[model samples]
Target: VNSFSGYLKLTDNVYIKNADIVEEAKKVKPTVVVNAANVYLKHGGGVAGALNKATNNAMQVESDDYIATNGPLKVGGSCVLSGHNLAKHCLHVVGPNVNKGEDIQLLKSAYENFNQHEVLLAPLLSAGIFGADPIHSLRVCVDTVRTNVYLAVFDKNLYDKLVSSFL
Candidate 1:
C-alpha cells in the first residue's frame, strides 16, 4: 500500500505530499477534502469514487441531493457537501474537460473556488479522465489556493515530476 512518503513546501502555506489522499484526510482531518467532480457531481470513479467509498457512500447520496436541488454544477464552479467519516466537509469542483476544449482560466477558476476552509486536502484536479496535463493542473493548484494546501499525489512517477518541478 502507498504511504506518506514526504512533502515539498511550495509556499509558507502550501505543501505537496506523495501519499494516499483518503488516508491523509483521515489522519489530518482537514476542514474539507476536495473532489475532482463532473458537472453532475456523480462520484463514479477516480478520486471521486475513492472518496465516495471512504465516506460510506454518503458523499454520493449528498452529491445526488445537491444536484437534484441545484442542478448541474457548471464547469469551473464548486459546492460544499457534508463530509462523513473523514473531513468536516467535502468540496466538489467541476473542472474543464480538456477533450471538450482546454480552458486554463476555467481550470484556474475551479481551483480558485475553494474558500473558507483553513486546511484544504485535494488531489490533482483535471489530470485524469478529464485529460488535463498533470503539470498544468498542478501549476494551477500551486498558483491558487491561499489556504494551507496539502496536495495528495498517489503515483510515484507524478510525485517525482512534481518534486522536480517544485522542490
Candidate 2:
C-alpha cells in the first residue's frame, strides 16, 4: 500500500493512504508480489505490546490466499506489526535473507530433521541450501532424496504441469 509523504499508514483498515506499495505492484499487474524483506504493523490491528495477537492471522508461506487482508501497508520494520500473532499452524514468511536472529547455517541442520519424515519433498530455488537456482538442483536433489525417501524437487514452472494434470 502507498502512503503519501505526509500521510500516516494505518492498520486493519481497508484502505492505506498513499499506498505506494500497491501502486508499484499494480504497475506490474497480475504478477505475484512477495516482499520477504520485512513488514510493519499499522493502526486498527493489534498493539506493539501484544505482538502475539497480531501474527495469528498473518500470511501463510505455503498458501496463495490470505487469512485476512489488512489492506493497509505498515512502516517501521523493527516492531513486528502484523495481522496475527506467532503460531505453529500458520506458515511463517520470514526467509533466510533477512537478518533475523536465526543463523542461515543452523537452518541447514534443521533440514536434516526432514530426513526423519517418510516423504519430504523440498521446493527448488527455495532461497538457499538447494542452491538459489531452483532448476539446476531439481534433478540432483530429487535423485538424492528419492533414493532415501519418496521425495522430489519440482521445477519453478509449476503451474502448467500442475494444471495439466487437473485438466
Candidate 3:
C-alpha cells in the first residue's frame, strides 16, 4: 500500500495522510471519526456504506432515530453516533450533493463545525460518491478542520491528484 503523510496548522492542529483510511484509523485509534453521510443515514454505498459495515450498522440505527427526532440533516450539518467498533464517537456529516449553483459555504460549514478532538479521521467529503471535485473538497477540509483534522485516503488516483494539487 502506498502511503504519505503531511501536516498543516489550524486553530488547533491538522494532519493529512494518504493511505488505507481504515488501516490508518485502526493504527491511530482516533477519538472521533468522520463519515460522509446522507440526510437519511442510509449507508448503502460509498464511504458511508463501508463505514456502516465497519460499525456493524450501529450508527444506522442511532442516526435514524436522531433524524426522526431532529428532522433530516441538511448539508453542512452532522450527527454524532456511537462508534461501535470504530472510534469513541462517529461524526456523520451530510455531504454536499453538488448541482448547478450549489452553495459551497454549507459544505465548508460542515467541516468547520467539527467537534474538538486530539485526532480525527475523515474521507474526502463530497468527492468520493457525492461526485464533487476532490481537490476542492480537500481544500475545504484543510480550511475548516482547523481542529486537528487528519485525512486518510485509500484510492491511488485520488491520492496522486491530491498530492499534485497541493504540493
Candidate 4:
C-alpha cells in the first residue's frame, strides 16, 4: 500500500507530508485543491498537467474559459475553478518566477490567496519550473496557509530535508 514517507504537524490545522498531492487529494478529498499555475492559467505540465489529466481535462477547459473571460492572472494572483473527479474546488495560483527576480513575497501571496476552506491540499509552489528553492517554498507554504492544510512534497530529497530539518 502507498503511504506517506514523512509527516510533520505544523499547527492544529496545518501539516506537511511526503506524498503526491494529486493522489492524496483523491483520498482525502479536501475542500479545495491548489494548482501551481502559470500566469496564463495553462495546465500544461508539472502539477498543473497532472491535475488536468486527473480531472479529465475539465481543469484546462475551465482555466481557458476563466482566462478568456477575465484575462491572464498576475504573479501572486489566484482564481477558483470548478473541480471535477476529486476535490470540490480548485484554486489556481500563480507563483513568482524567481529566475526573473520576482521576490518571495509574491510566493507568499500565492498561499495567502486561500480565503475560505475547511481543508486545502497544496503542492510546493514555485519549486518546479518557476525555479524557487524547495526549502524556501515549503517555508512559505507552512507560514501562510491559514486553514487546515496538507502540504504534499513529491520529491524524496525534499521530503528528506523536511524530515531532517523542518520537523
Candidate 5:
C-alpha cells in the first residue's frame, strides 16, 4: 500500500493484500458492511444496508454506501462510461477476467477521475470460491478478476466485508 506524493508519485510504503504493497488505506473504525452483492445499493431504504449511491450514480458516490455496476472492462468494454441504463458501471470497474494490468490501471484512473480518488475501500462479492463454479454468481465476478485490482469507497462496511474482513 504505497502512498502517492502526486500523479504516479508513490511514497510511504506499507504492504497491501500481498503483505508488501505499502502504506495501508485509511481504515474506518466500527466498520460497516457496504452490502455490494445485490444489484441494487439502495437496499432496505438505505439504512440497514449501511450506505447509498452518490447523486444517483454519477461517479460522485458518497461515504457509507455502495453501488452495483455490471460488466467491467476485462471483456472489452468502457472503463470511463457510467449511467443508469441497467447495464451500468455504477462504481464497479472490475476486470471480470482480469488477466492483464488494465484493471489495476483502471482503478487508479478511476480514483483520478473522481475528486476523492484516494484509497478506495470496496468489497469483492465473488462468492463461488467456497465450493462452486467460478461463474456461479455475481459475487464470483468480483473474485474472478485475474488482475491486481484496487478499490476505493466511502462506505466502511463494504471495506470491512472485503479488504478489512471481520477485523
Candidate 6:
C-alpha cells in the first residue's frame, strides 16, 4: 500500500501537489500533459521518461518524428500536440538545465506557448532530472500556470513540507 497524503490546492485553480500524478491526470482529465524532456524529446529518464513508458511511448515516437522533420528545440521552446496516450495533447519542452531563474523562464515560456486550455497536468519539470530543488520548481509552476494546472508530487517529504508550510 503506497501511503500518500492527498491533494492540496495552492492557488485558486492550481493544485499544489499530488502523490499520484497518473491518478490526478485521470481525475482532472486535463487537455494537455506537459513532457519535461531534453531538446531532442528523449523521454528515457525522470518524470517524462516514466510517463512515456506508462503511456506506451506515444509522445516519444511523435516527438522523434517531429524532430526528424524539424530541428531540435531550444531550452525555452515547446511544442503542443494532440493524440497522446493519457490526455488529448502533449506539451513538450526542453527545460532548464541551470538555476531557478533559468528554469522559471523556461517554464513561463512553455506555458505561454500553450494555446487556450482549461486544464493541464504536469510534474516538476526540472526538479528531478535537471536537479533543481522541488520548492523552486513548484513555485515557478504555480506562479506561471494560468489554467487549472494539477502539479503532481511523487515524493512524500516534498509534498508534506510544501503542504504544511502553506497550511
- The numbered model that scores best in lDDT is 1
lDDT of 1 by residue, 105-166 (tens): 78888888765677788888888778888888877877787777778988788888877976
Off by over 4 Å in 2: 1-111, 125-131, 143-167
lDDT of 6 by residue, 1-167 (tens): 11223547688767756556666555555667777767887878777777677778776888789889987888877777653556777777666766434644566665554335666677776776577776776776666767676677778787887677663
**What tens digits encode model 3's per-residue C-alpha lDDT throughout 75-148?**
77787777667677788887677743346667787776574554678887777667788888877877667556
lDDT of each: 0.81, 0.26, 0.71, 0.80, 0.27, 0.68
Question: What are the TM-scores, per candidate, against the unseen true structure?
Answer: 0.90, 0.25, 0.83, 0.88, 0.24, 0.80
* Candidate 5 lDDT tens digits, 1-167: 33322121112211123210112122221111122322222223222133223224432342223323442233222233232322123333222223322233233332222223223323332221212222232233243333323433233443334443321
As for candidate 6, its clashing pairs are none
- In model 6, which range of ten residues has the least summed lDDT? 1-10
Q: Model 2: how large is the Cα RMSD against the reference?
A: 17.5
Q: Which ten residues in a row have the lowest lDDT in candidate 3?
A: 1-10
Q: Is 5 or 6 the stronger prediction by lDDT?
A: 6
Query: What is candidate 6's TM-score against the reference?
Result: 0.80
Which 10 consecutive residues of model 4 have the lowest summed lDDT? 1-10
Q: How many clashes (backbone atoms < 3 Å, residues ≥3 apart in a chain or on different chains) does model 4 have? A: 0
